[PDB]
Amino acid sequence: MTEYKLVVVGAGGVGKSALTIQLIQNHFVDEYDPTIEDSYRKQVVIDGETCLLDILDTGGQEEYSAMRDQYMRTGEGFLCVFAINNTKSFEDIHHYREQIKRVKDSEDVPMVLVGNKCDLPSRTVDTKQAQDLARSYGIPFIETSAKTRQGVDDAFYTLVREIRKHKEK
Numbered sequence: 243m244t245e246y247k248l249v250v251v252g253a254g255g256v257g258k259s260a261l262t263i264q265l266i267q268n269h270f271v272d273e274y275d276p277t278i279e280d281s282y283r284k285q286v287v288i289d290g291e292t293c294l295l296d297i298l299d300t301g302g303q304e305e306y307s308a309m310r311d312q313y314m315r316t317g318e319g320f321l322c323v324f325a326i327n328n329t330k331s332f333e334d335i336h337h338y339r340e341q342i343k344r345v346k347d348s349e350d351v352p353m354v355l356v357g358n359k360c361d362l363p364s365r366t367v368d369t370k371q372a373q374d375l376a377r378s379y380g381i382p383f384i385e386t387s388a389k390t391r392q393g394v395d396d397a398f399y400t401l402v403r404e405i406r407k408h409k410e411k
């Protein structure tokens with residue numbers, strides 16, 4: 243049973259918690275709307291291997307986090323989440339990636355670009371835009387919806403697979 247330290251980053255309001263809660267929910271509680279950063283666990287089987295995922299639901303750059311730097315040192319992979327109807331949240335991706343490279347002193351950090359809220363017909367960030375940005379970073383791009391659960395599990399599974407590939411380099 244391998245452990246993976248996952249960290250979700252992005253501007254506030256993009257759906258970092260909705261994604262994390264939908265992934266880890268055992269649904270004992272009907273509704274859970276966390277506003278404070280926290281860590282969640284889920285045991286999942288990926289490609290036959292039982293994985294133990296620790297997912298850190300970080301707050302946006304606005305919310306102060308004393309352990310932010312340490313969270314990124316411990317983190318092995320990062321979900322960079324933006325909202326396809328929020329152009330600023332998409333532009334903010336550069337800030338969060340630079341923040342990760344600054345602390346980990348590397349350009350080869352496992353990451354996945356996540357365009358959340360793909361359930362909304364009206365979007366401002368085209369698929370080509372995000373796919374192009376992901377290419378410039380050398381990381382995968384996945385569209386997700388924390389409402390319809392579209393691509394939610396695949397986003398985290400993809401990141402785990404990115405960590406495993408990186409670790410086997």
Ligand SMILES: Nc1nc2c(ncn2[C@@H]2O[C@H](COP(=O)(O)OP(=O)(O)CP(=O)(O)O)[C@@H](O)[C@H]2O)c(=O)[nH]1
Pocket residue numbers: 252253254255256257258259260261276277278299300301302358359360361362386387388389390
């Ligand atoms: N239509 C739609 N709304 C979404 C989706 N994901 C989240 N939302 C909505 O966006 C708002 C912000 O969600 P939230 O999970 O708090 O995002 P956040 O600010 O990145 C997470 P936190 O700040 O707690 O780390 C909420 O009203 C939520 O219902 C989605 O996939 N589709």
